[PDB]
Design a binder for this molecule. Sequence first.
Ligand SMILES: [K+]
Ligand SMILES: [K+]
Ligand SMILES: [K+]
Ligand SMILES: [K+]
Ligand SMILES: [K+]
Ligand SMILES: [Mg+2]
Ligand SMILES: [Mg+2]
Ligand SMILES: [Mg+2]
Ligand SMILES: [Mg+2]
Ligand SMILES: [Mg+2]
Ligand SMILES: [Mg+2]
Ligand SMILES: [Mg+2]
Ligand SMILES: [Mg+2]
Ligand SMILES: [Mg+2]
Ligand SMILES: [Mg+2]
Ligand SMILES: [Mg+2]
Ligand SMILES: [Mg+2]
Ligand SMILES: [Mg+2]
Ligand SMILES: [Mg+2]
Ligand SMILES: [Mg+2]
Ligand SMILES: [Mg+2]
Ligand SMILES: [Mg+2]
Ligand SMILES: [Mg+2]
Ligand SMILES: [Mg+2]
Ligand SMILES: [Mg+2]
Ligand SMILES: [Mg+2]
Ligand SMILES: [Mg+2]
Ligand SMILES: [Mg+2]
Ligand SMILES: [Mg+2]
Ligand SMILES: [Mg+2]
Ligand SMILES: [Mg+2]
Lengths: 46, 124, 181, 238, 394, 333, 101
Amino acid sequence: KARGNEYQPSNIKRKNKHGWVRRLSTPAGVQVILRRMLKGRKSLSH
Amino acid sequence: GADRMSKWTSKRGPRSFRGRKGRGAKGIGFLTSGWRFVQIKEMVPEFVVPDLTGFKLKPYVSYLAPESEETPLTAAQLFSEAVAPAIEKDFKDGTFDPDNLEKYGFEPTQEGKLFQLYPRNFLR
Amino acid sequence: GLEEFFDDPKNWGQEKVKSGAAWTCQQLRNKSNEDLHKLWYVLLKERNMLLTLEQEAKRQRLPMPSPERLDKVVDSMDALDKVVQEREDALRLLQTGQERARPGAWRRDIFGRIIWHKFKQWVIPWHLNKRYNRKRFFALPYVDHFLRLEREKRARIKARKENLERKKAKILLKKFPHLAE
Amino acid sequence: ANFVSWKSRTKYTITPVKMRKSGGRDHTGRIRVHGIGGGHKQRYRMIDFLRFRPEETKSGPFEEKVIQVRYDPCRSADIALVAGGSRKRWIIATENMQAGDTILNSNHIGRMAVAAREGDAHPLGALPVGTLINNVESEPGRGAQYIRAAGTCGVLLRKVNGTAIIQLPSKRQMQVLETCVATVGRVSNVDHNKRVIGKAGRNRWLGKRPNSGRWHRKGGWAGRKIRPLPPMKSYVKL
Amino acid sequence: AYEWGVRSTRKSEPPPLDRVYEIPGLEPITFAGKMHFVPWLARPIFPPWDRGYKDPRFYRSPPLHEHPLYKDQACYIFHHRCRLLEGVKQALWLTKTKLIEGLPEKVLSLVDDPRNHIENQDECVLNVISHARLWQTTEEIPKRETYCPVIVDNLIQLCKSQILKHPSLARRICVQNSTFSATWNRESLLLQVRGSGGARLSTKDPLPTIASREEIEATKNHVLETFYPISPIIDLHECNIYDVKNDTGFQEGYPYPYPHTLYLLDKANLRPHRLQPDQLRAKMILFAFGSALAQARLLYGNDAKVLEQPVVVQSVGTDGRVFHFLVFQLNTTDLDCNEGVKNLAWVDSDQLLYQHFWCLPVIKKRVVVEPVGPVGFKPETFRKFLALYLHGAA
Amino acid sequence: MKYMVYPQTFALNADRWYQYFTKTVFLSGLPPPPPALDLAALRAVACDCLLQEHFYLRRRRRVHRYEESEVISLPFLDQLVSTLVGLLSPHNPALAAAALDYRCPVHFYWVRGEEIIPRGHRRGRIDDLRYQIDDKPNNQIRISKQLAEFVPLDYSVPIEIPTIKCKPDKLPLFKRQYENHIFVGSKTADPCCYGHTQFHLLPDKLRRERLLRQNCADQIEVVFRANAIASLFAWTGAQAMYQGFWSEADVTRPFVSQAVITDGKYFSFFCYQLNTLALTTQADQNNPRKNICWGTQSKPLYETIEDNDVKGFNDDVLLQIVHFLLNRPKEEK
Amino acid sequence: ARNVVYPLYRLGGPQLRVFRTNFFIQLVRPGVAQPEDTVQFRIPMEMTRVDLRNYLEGIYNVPVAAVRTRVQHGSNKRRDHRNVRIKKPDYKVAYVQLAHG
RNA sequence: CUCCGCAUAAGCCUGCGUCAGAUUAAAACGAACUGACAAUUAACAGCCCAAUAUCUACAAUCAACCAACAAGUCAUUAUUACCCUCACUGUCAACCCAACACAGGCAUGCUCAUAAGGAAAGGUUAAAAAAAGUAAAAGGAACUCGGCAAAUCUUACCCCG
RNA sequence: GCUACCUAAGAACAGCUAAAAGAGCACACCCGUCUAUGUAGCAAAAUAGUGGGAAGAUUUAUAGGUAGAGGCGACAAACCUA
RNA sequence: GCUAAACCUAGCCCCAAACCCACUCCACCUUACUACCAGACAACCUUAGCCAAACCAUUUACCCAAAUAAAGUAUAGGCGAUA
Ligand SMILES: [K+]
Ligand SMILES: [K+]
Ligand SMILES: [K+]
Ligand SMILES: [K+]
Ligand SMILES: [K+]
Ligand SMILES: [Mg+2]
Ligand SMILES: [Mg+2]
Ligand SMILES: [Mg+2]
Ligand SMILES: [Mg+2]
Ligand SMILES: [Mg+2]
Ligand SMILES: [Mg+2]
Ligand SMILES: [Mg+2]
Ligand SMILES: [Mg+2]
Ligand SMILES: [Mg+2]
Ligand SMILES: [Mg+2]
Ligand SMILES: [Mg+2]
Ligand SMILES: [Mg+2]
Ligand SMILES: [Mg+2]
Ligand SMILES: [Mg+2]
Ligand SMILES: [Mg+2]
Ligand SMILES: [Mg+2]
Ligand SMILES: [Mg+2]
Ligand SMILES: [Mg+2]
Ligand SMILES: [Mg+2]
Ligand SMILES: [Mg+2]
Ligand SMILES: [Mg+2]
Ligand SMILES: [Mg+2]
Ligand SMILES: [Mg+2]
Ligand SMILES: [Mg+2]
Ligand SMILES: [Mg+2]
Ligand SMILES: [Mg+2]
């Protein structure tokens, strides 16, 4: 029916899906963190 | 939809997240069955406050105190002030030996001491 | 007791309160360790009193009688800490030769950056620590490109700074001809 | 993925063990078998298929009293709890096995045959020719694997040159050694194949997800295939 | 045979070792000096590490065979949790006793006098049942763990309210958290009963002997029944690290040493957890025998002989609705043999205090059918309980 | 939302706050008074119970100090109460038919005072101050008859009830919302509805040594008084509401009760008489009645326990326990 | 102390002692009605109630009976130039009850 | 009027408390806008539990009769080790997900019509067309693709599944 | 974090007839047959009336898993952040 | 007459020269920025396509260590495009 509310907040889910440990577990996430550091993002991970 | 810029504190998240996070206070004990906390007196820091009766020093210094040269304390200066007189005296008297530096004040190993310079096992 | 958190009742409400100078590094070196300890506690009491007065002034929307006293106390305490640290460092250098009181090492991180890793106190050996072993202190051969890109970015920043400085010098010389000599 | 098998217990016990459903997913999280998922919660009860398992500090033939015969969710047959000496075990109950009976497990092979008393376990060589058996083992000490389902039974067709020729429920001939221990009689729940599901929800209760709605055109594999009986499967190694 | 435990769940094997160690005379270069792991350098071999100082929270016990009280001979321990398979028959075989149905005539006749009856017996027992099953707590339906001990305590208090009629009832107390241990032999098998929990009636007057020397001697004709092919030591904790001691539950000088009656409860809220009546009766018999044997060994020494003075111990085992009564008379300490003088056990089994209790009214077709309260109340069970309580005093 | 009033509390000066919350005035000493007994036998029984719980019973576990309370003192109190009531049943016939409850819940819910909500959408609205007491006395005695009144219903005292100068939240006292219970230890259908005597055991958290270390030396009697007042007020109010009296229908007769607080070694005795339930502001604007709580200072029952001997047994404390148990309801003509 | 590495403790061992503490407190006027024997302080996060009690009993010689601490959170709602949130620092509010009336 | 309301969980993070200003509220004083100053105090929850061997067949449904199948959340023992105590974190609000002060979405416990929570009308007049309702002479489907809508709360069938 | 399917441990289902129900009437609750309104709307799918189910193949809270030459699907070429 | 209009700096771009970064204290790979317990998880492996050949299927330039010249020469290629 009505859409737009696909984001149901959940801190545990957010930290597990997007987090420092999750990024550093795999080499791809390390590359993502490296790209964010190179660009200069204030927030590198959720 | 979450503020990534804000600092992640113990006030955010579910009950487990809020309870597993602290503000930086050092632990003074441990948990046991029944979620029962046992406190360790030795782990609890003990303040050392001296007696301030008859202490002539005051928080401020009068502006009439003359200016003095600034000389930061160095290892060589400390050795000259403390160990050099005794070493020179023993050398002149002939009693000097290269095996009693510990007698002169040297510490071979910090192990076995309550206060160890390296690694520092004592608080300020 | 709780009276020490407040200034003298006669001095309460005064617009200005007289104060002396702050203890200097040489003056504090001239004193013994026990004297430094007692003076540190006295300065701590004075600093607590001044912080209480400042907070109450902010609460009552009135100017502090003498803000400079807090700065003087802070400077004196910093000088005392500096003197004590100098004595401790000299004694450590004499007895053991180590510069720092906390063991550390130069480690390459997972991102290829060389950092100073300060050791922590543990009970189990280093190899038996699961959480410590989970940490990576090496960079696989996919960070070299990012390191090169960061180096090039820093070089660009430095070149921009130098060129801007040269342009400013040229503009200054143009405005003031006599600076050529 | 993070898939840890629930089959982690290494010690036998009669206590029911909680089992985790798979839903047809393998350790990679992919659907490897379709039509599996859901169903009623079940606990697994370990079954000792090695009928001749003498307890420690003992040897030779023994006998066990059947304490109980009851239902098992993990299999179509019934499970008999029995006790021998100081050891209590679960086995597969035969067609006629109730409380108070005394089953006999033996490994003795003689020139004469045996009475073949229902649930008793005897070697194939000891068992008489043309006898109904169940829970046979391919190799000595391997454990019963080839007759387990409810109402299934094989027949000892032949005993030639120290080898036993049996007829599996699929009517295929299987040759094994004569020292393989087998249990006489038929397995319990003879009328298992006569059950009626009744409603589409009973399959869901048994954890059988419905088939896909896609229409697949039948090919050359379909149609009746009259084929000769496969050759005898022999595990006797020369 | 089938082996339990799949290799995926089993611990993974370590990775193969590098060949620098295999090569002789060559010192491997590892990351042991770097204090962290690097893929290129070889994996060091770490020597075993001992903590040195004893940390209670991180203590690892020595191997089982290195314990001081380790014996190759196996002792079969029976505790409160143990549930016998055969039940009463196995308990009789282990305890070397003969079973007699029905309570002793003396105990039954102790309450035949209407004077010994409690005033308003039926009303008081109904009030006790209603209080335990419905009025105990704020919950609509109190659970068994709540209403079984309450029932037992209220019945004990109601029986104890007869001190005016019998002054001897003031010479007894009730003790909780009392543990006793006894050890004996049966066909060269070492058995040990460790009874813990429950309520122990502690008195200073020993119970009179229920039976007579004529019956004690006539018990020789009785032969214990076997249950082949089931070993008598089945469903008992077989242990190798054990100690053999004869403890009566209290130190010397206790004012109330004699165990009069032991109250056992089956209060688990789950039917699988609750013991069967046969298992509960077997547990009662074993606990009574253990208490009697401990008292006999304390009084007459550790020697094996025929007790000139038999030891009488009573037991009441209940589940909140069903009761079982036992009077056990120990007559001998020579238990190794299967023949000779045997103990006695008068057992009354499966006495229902009530049939069912309705915590809420039953309404069918808008008409009340079953009012709240006990259904099928039987005062004979309470009369037998009162007789057991008053035994040795009235 | 309601304040959870804890009888055994770590709060400081909580006795005055509880007096304000219950409209109770505290008096010192005992209320004025309106076959042969063997004191030697009673002392022997008490010593036997104490020695059984301390020395005679062979513990199978290394009893720690934290466990010591539940290991020793609670069974000791239960067994002592049981033996004493059994021995005093001949002297007091009411104890024979009395019901002895071991660790049963006691609840009471009452409203006193009003507040103005400071913030939220409910700002500037009158909200009643609600309180809930959830107590589990170790041992209590219930009967079907009510004990005689200590003082008349209109009795007055010169001592004024203390008034708190701030909110109850500074006690500290916290608010929570859950089911409101009014319980006497049993449901309304129980014939034994009135109370005779309660027995309370202080927890390890409120022990004398810990209070001395925390500099709460003067707070021991405060804790005793607070626990006694809260428990007895809850019991009396629950009994009154079971009889049918509430804020708008105040009690026509006083409801009396007795409490014995103990820490295993020290005992204190309290008597409470509920004279009013109109604690709400509307019904208390013109209510002159005051609840009264009589109390006694804590005294040691014994000095030390050495081997098979008890040192310094307190016959006065034993006799006070005996008198509390021997108090009996009046008999009508 | 603050911003220091506490030595690790093992069973037995010596007592952790601090000689020159750097914990600075300030006695603040309560914003709401408080009991007479109640004093309110503002302290850093790294200071516990036990540490505050020892601090008061050793430095100022104030008898202390009970200490209750809470963490007060500063407002981050304010937006400065460039629409960037400015974080008001958080602190710890401590309530101390005098131990001798 | 009461669709609710109160509390917890989840979520957000100071977001109608005081003072000094009144930008601003889909009008407007209110204040939710600006600055400064206060605050939420643990008993309620989170944060737990030494080792090696070993034990655990008997459902819940008031669990008592029967009655089943889909076969079921809710246990130990033996030995060794173990004197020591009340730390830390959450506690505010008119609040979350939908670009909004959005008629949408939102899990539980209690209340079952309220003891708690709110206001459909800025003022006037009563044109057309439009929307939601009420009532209607006589006829009662003659309307229409079709009894669509509304009212009363029928009978007998056919095709497909 | 929506949704398709699955895994682990949880929760809810008033009342009436019959009780043996993938049974009937009928609230919470789920879904969405028909009509009207709205069509830059209150809403990038809603409101009112009227409807189907409502002890089961039901609804639902939390955590985890299946990732695009794919997943998943009681096949609608469905769903996989409008 | 409002709304408005106008500005000259901040700085940036291309070269040249020169091979740049690194730790007051504390915290930071677990839910990063979290004082403090029994692990063993460790890296390596042809790029493919768009496009051109007027479709497309073989094929289609992509700095690899000296500017220029040899030289778009030899040579390769559905001997076509082109290399
Ligand atoms: K089956
Ligand atoms: K918010
Ligand atoms: K037509
Ligand atoms: K909407
Ligand atoms: K093309
Ligand atoms: Mg969105
Ligand atoms: Mg969801
Ligand atoms: Mg199956
Ligand atoms: Mg099919
Ligand atoms: Mg099909
Ligand atoms: Mg707190
Ligand atoms: Mg708690
Ligand atoms: Mg709140
Ligand atoms: Mg929903
Ligand atoms: Mg209202
Ligand atoms: Mg309007
Ligand atoms: Mg208008
Ligand atoms: Mg009409
Ligand atoms: Mg027509
Ligand atoms: Mg018609
Ligand atoms: Mg027409
Ligand atoms: Mg219609
Ligand atoms: Mg159909
Ligand atoms: Mg499941
Ligand atoms: Mg229903
Ligand atoms: Mg149905
Ligand atoms: Mg229906
Ligand atoms: Mg189709
Ligand atoms: Mg199609
Ligand atoms: Mg082309
Ligand atoms: Mg084309």
